[PDB]
């Protein structure tokens, strides 16, 4: 399933990045590229299935400690 990430999922990810003081360019896109073993250069280029995995990881991080 290669449906692109939807706007709702993107907005939840953006929310957590801001709360974590992290960014797509410095933090998340590099990690997504390593985990998904593919060149991911923009937030819009994730699949919805990939974005859901990233979102779960961000939720873990935001839930863990202040």
């Amino acid at each position: 399933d290669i449906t692109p990430v939807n706007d709702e999922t993107m907005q939840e990810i953006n929310t957590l990045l801001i709360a974590l003081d992290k960014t797509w360019d410095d933090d998340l896109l590099p990690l997504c590229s390593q985990i998904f073993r593919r060149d991911i250069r923009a937030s819009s280029e994730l699949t919805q299935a990939e974005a859901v995995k990233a979102l779960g990881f961000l939720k873990q991080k935001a839930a863990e400690q202040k």
Partner: peptide
């Protein structure tokens, strides 16, 4: 493979 279920720093 490292993946998003792992306890990796961020």
């Amino acid at each position: 493979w490292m993946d998003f279920d792992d306890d990796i720093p961020f």
